[PDB]
Each structure stands twice: as structure tokens, then as C-alpha cells.
């Protein structure tokens, strides 16, 4: 391909373009997640920010991947960006569960890419994923599990009451 | 009449005058709300200060209007200010809804004036309302919507406990 | 409850939703333009940054629209995001031209919305578009026009040397 | 094998001693490249420094390897250093192709070593290369690829004018 391409597999190149579309997509759902909680009849500032922060994280990811793509001599190819799975995310636990579900999916794609790069004998690619993606995913998933356990501990009949306290005392305005 | 009056219909003039009386009535009802929640047998500092800040926000309102009336060459014309609708305002949710009604009524009146202003092709009056009133209302009403929602979430058999947690963790005696 | 909604038309709500989609799309294409110029075979850092900044602009653009939608009582309704109309953008003059048309489509969509809100007699929507959008587009299109004029002024047979000077002296790696 | 040597293959050990000779060799070519452009009849300070900087880097390279060699318990075995391939590198585009070709050779040596260490089940060596070498080469090659492209763009006939503008506006005496 380019004058710089060296030991960069045609498969992995296609594989990353795929991952960037996945992250773009992920980002899109968090954006949705974020404004959902900003609705006057949901009003959970704390959780809203939580998701907006995540949307930016996802953005940083695909931008990170796109930068890498250009460094290895690969050519970025864009695709449509599927709209989020839902339009209304019910209550916080529901939002979290979905968010985690999404992250596990994202983590798997990462493990898959790594496995491929490992196969096509791509040490720079594997190193890249481990440095900027693998540990990030593990930590976010742990964090979400913690949130889940906590939200569950605040379950009904004092459901609403617990959802409020969780946004105030854990998610916090900040 | 006045040496400065130009393109200022006598209708918007009487209308602004009517609007300052409205804002005077609103501010007065917010004063009532504030001291009701300062009562020893209600004692919710956070909501009392919430309403007192609103009495200020309305006072700024009619003052800003009287200031404009003069800038255009109109003449102020004060009328009696009716006492607030209620002497007692029940609980936070009740008080908030009352506030919500009051603000929506106020927003309608702002929108009516803006219509009259466009009918009398008065571009200054219209811009004046958009810069210092319309968005202010949109935002205040949006915030009350959030409080109203968050309060309904705290409702139920432990409503009293929720009312306290809201005054502490959201309105905050700050 | 969307008990806050007042004077917000159902058709404008849909139009704003449609506008955010148009902004999500514009952002997307700028994301594409952005990394294209980062390619080792295009290698024009100056223009790459120029477009990456525009994607951020459009991003803040649609995020601003969503924030408003909720403030009015509207509901965000996301759709698929169509991929950029191109995979490669040729040379600077070509890209700039593409961006310009994108900006005009946008400006047009904004003017159309203002027209609708005006018709639906929604002063807040109108003030909002005039405040955060209309002037920004004009200033941006004028800037683009200026670059076009300058790039053209740097036309062949030494257009290659001209394209390098522009990125160095006008866009600047900053 | 000394008191510290552990899981440190004799193959990889010989590999590194060979690699430092390669970096020592690369270093030497850059000194040659660096001073050629310092000639009164070439006079291109910007490129001269770009190469003296690359020599500095290669020095850090082999030094990092020697420092590593001792940490694993291996012994350094030095050899003669082959003189640079050329004595005059012609023009900026000629040198860059040279350096590019040099870096590619080096990056291949790295990837090879990684494969060997990976094969001899040596995790520390692998990690060491990913952390201090692979990504550096990827960045430098992408870098040189941009320079080449920008050089080719400043093509001809004004190769002379374009070669001066590149050394002034891209490489910079700074
Ligand atoms: Cs590794
Ligand atoms: Cs207006
Ligand atoms: Cs304004
Ligand atoms: Cs690693
Ligand atoms: Cs690492």
C-alpha cells in the first residue's frame, strides 16, 4: 500500500475500521443515554453526566484507533452508524445493565482484534490495544458492576428513594 | 408624547404596565412561599431560600420592565397588587406545582406581549423580551420540572423522609 | 411529565430532531475529512486540524440542540447516521469546496427551521437559532470563501507548492 | 550465565548484540547524513539538524539495549561498525528515501527479534521492545512518509525553491 506500510495485515486493517464503527456506535448510544437522563421527567443529573463522560471516552477511543490506522499505513473506511438500541432507557439499573452489556460487547471485540493481530504476528497492534484499551475496559466494567450491586442494594419498595440517593451520593453533580 | 417616544404603540405600553403588575404579584406570592417554609412547623430552609431567590428574580423582572418603559418614553402606571392565592402552601410538591403554574402563567403573558409587539411591528420590545425573559422562563420552568419529577420519585409512604432528603441533598440550605 | 412544554410545536420538535441528525452527519464527514489529510500520502497537518476542529464545532452544535430540546419538553429521537458522501477527498480546494456545500446545506436547514418556528410563532426557538447558530454559519462560510479564494489564487502550474504554502502560512499547524 | 540470568535465551542474547551493531551502524549513517547537509555547498541547516537528532536517537537506542543486556545477565559483544553506504546523499528527497529505507530495515530487525524472543517464550524482552522500540519506529516512519509526500509535492521544476521552503517551514532551524 503506502510507502510506510510494514507488517500490517490486510485483515487487521479491515478489523480496525470495523472496531471504529463499533466505538462510533457505542459513543452514539451513550450520547442518547446521556440526554435521556437530562429529560425533565427523568431528571437524574448525576447519571446523565456519567453517560456523557462515557460518550467522550468512546469518542477518544475511535479517534485513537483512527490515528493508529494512519500510522500503520492503513486506510480508514467509514460506514453508517447504527442508531442506539433503545430510545428510552427506563430507570438507572436498566441503563447500567445496558451500558455494561455494551461494554462487554466492546471488550470482546477488543479481545478478538488482539487475537487476530496476535495471529497475523502483529506485536505493535497488540501492544497498542493493551496500552489504551484492555485495562480501560476491565476498569469500567468493574465500576459498572459496583454501581449495579449498589443500585440493587437500594431496590424497591424504596426504589425511587434509592435511585435518588444513588445519584446524589455516588454519581454526584460531579 | 415625550420627546423620545418613537414606534412605541400605546397598546404595548398599557400591556407592559399590566405585565409589571403581574410580576409584582408573582414576586409577592414568592415572598409568601418563602416565609411559609421558614415557619417552625414546616422548617425547610432549602425550599424557603429557593422561593426567596425567586422573589428576587421577579423583582429584577418588573424593575427591568419599568426601566424599559421609561427608555421608550412610556409612562408607568401602578395598580393594586393582589395578595397571593393561598396563605398556606402545604408541602414542597404542592408549593412547587403552584410555582410551576405561576411561572407558566407568566411565560404565557411574556409570549402574549411578544405577539402584540410583532403585531405592532416593534422590533425593540421583541428583542428585549427574548434577551431578558423568554430563555429565563424556559430555564426556570425546566428546573422546576426536574424538582417536581425528583420529588414524585421521593413520594410514597416515606414521603416525609423524601421531602427532607430533597431539601438537604438538592435545594440545600445553600 | 412533559408538564413544562409550552408553545413548543410538535412539527418543530421533529424538525430539530432532524437537524441534530444533520449535524451528527456533518460532524461525521468532518471526522472523515480530518483523518484523510492525516494520511502519509496526503500529509497536510494544517488542513487536517482545520477539519478536526470543525467536527468539534458541529458536535457542540448538535449537543446544544439536544440540550435545548429537553429544555422545551421535546424528546430526542435518533436515527442512523449516514456515512460521509466520500471516502477520499482529493486536494485541499476539493475538500474546502465540499465543506462549503455542507455548510450551506446546514445554513439552509437552519433558515428553514427559523421560518417554521416563526410560522409556528415560537419566539424562543427563533431567538435561540439567531443566538447560537445563524451568525456562526455566516462567519464560517465567509471564512471558507476566503480560503477558497486564496487557494485558487495559488492555482497551478505550481499548485502543489501553493497547497503547501497555504497549510503552512494560512491554516497553520495551530 | 551469571547469578542473575533467568529465562534469557542464548539466541536472543546474540540477537541483541547484533542489533546494537545495527543501531550503532544506523547512528553512524545519520552523522554522515547530518554533516553532509552542513556543507557550504549543500547548506540546509533544517535537514542537517533533523538528522543529527536522529543520530542522537539511535544512540539512545543501542544504549538502551546495552543497558538491557546487562540487566538480563547477557554480555555485550561488539564488532566493527560498517561505514555509511554513501558519502554524499544528494538532495533532501534522496536522503529521506535513504533514511526511510534505513528505518524500515531497523523496524524489521526489531520485529524479528520480537518473534525470536516470543518463540523462546521471553515475555520481558517482548514487553521491552514494545515499550521502547516498536511504536517509536512506527511514529518515525509515518513521520518520514509525511516528509517524503510533502517533498514530492514541492516537486519540480521548482525543486530548488520547494526544497528551501520545506527546510524553512517544516523542518525548521528549530
Ligand atoms: Cs504483549
Ligand atoms: Cs426576533
Ligand atoms: Cs438575543
Ligand atoms: Cs506490552
Ligand atoms: Cs506497555
Swiss-Prot record, chains A, B, C, D:
Principal subcellular localisation of the protein: cytoplasm
GO cellular component term of the entry, any: membrane
Pfam families linked: Ferritin
Places the protein is found: Cytoplasmic vesicle, Autophagosome; Cytoplasm; Autolysosome
Stretches the record annotates as Catalytic site for iron oxidation: 53-60
Quaternary structure and partners: Oligomer of 24 subunits. There are two types of subunits: L (light) chain and H (heavy) chain. The major chain can be light or heavy, depending on the species and tissue type. The functional molecule forms a roughly spherical shell with a diameter of 12 nm and contains a central cavity into which the insoluble mineral iron core is deposited. Iron enters the spherical protein shell through pores that are formed between subunits. Mutations leading to truncation or the addition of extra residues at the C-terminus interfere with normal pore formation and with iron accumulation.
Disease implication from the record: Hyperferritinemia with or without cataract: An autosomal dominant disease characterized by elevated level of ferritin in serum and tissues, and early-onset bilateral cataract. Cataracts may be subclinical in some patients. Neurodegeneration with brain iron accumulation 3: A neurodegenerative disorder associated with iron accumulation in the brain, primarily in the basal ganglia. It is characterized by a variety of neurological signs including parkinsonism, ataxia, corticospinal signs, mild non-progressive cognitive deficit and episodic psychosis. It is linked with decreased serum ferritin levels.
Free-text function comment from the UniProt entry: Stores iron in a soluble, non-toxic, readily available form. Important for iron homeostasis. Iron is taken up in the ferrous form and deposited as ferric hydroxides after oxidation. Also plays a role in delivery of iron to cells. Mediates iron uptake in capsule cells of the developing kidney. Delivery to lysosomes by the cargo receptor NCOA4 for autophagic degradation and release or iron.
Name of the protein in its database record: Ferritin light chain
Organism: Homo sapiens
Amino acid at each position: 500500500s503506502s510507502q510506510i506500510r510494514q507488517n500490517y495485515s490486510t485483515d487487521v486493517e479491515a478489523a480496525v475500521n470495523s472496531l471504529v464503527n463499533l466505538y462510533l456506535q457505542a459513543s452514539y448510544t451513550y450520547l442518547s443515554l446521556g440526554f435521556y437522563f437530562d429529560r425533565d421527567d427523568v431528571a437524574l443529573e448525576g447519571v446523565s453526566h456519567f453517560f456523557r463522560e462515557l460518550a467522550e471516552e468512546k469518542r477518544e477511543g475511535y479517534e485513537r484507533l483512527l490515528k493508529m490506522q494512519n500510522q500503520r499505513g492503513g486506510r480508514a473506511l467509514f460506514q453508517d452508524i447504527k442508531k442506539p438500541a433503545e430510545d428510552e432507557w427506563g430507570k438507572t439499573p436498566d441503563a447500567m445493565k445496558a451500558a455494561m452489556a455494551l461494554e462487554k460487547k466492546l471488550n470482546q471485540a477488543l479481545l478478538d482484534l488482539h487475537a487476530l493481530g496476535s495471529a497475523r504476528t502483529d506485536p505493535h497492534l497488540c501492544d497498542f490495544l493493551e496500552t489504551h484499551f484492555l485495562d480501560e475496559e476491565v476498569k469500567l466494567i468493574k465500576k459498572m458492576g459496583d454501581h449495579l450491586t449498589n443500585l440493587h442494594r437500594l431496590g424497591g419498595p424504596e426504589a425511587g428513594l434509592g435511585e435518588y440517593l444513588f445519584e446524589r451520593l455516588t454519581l454526584k453533580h460531579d
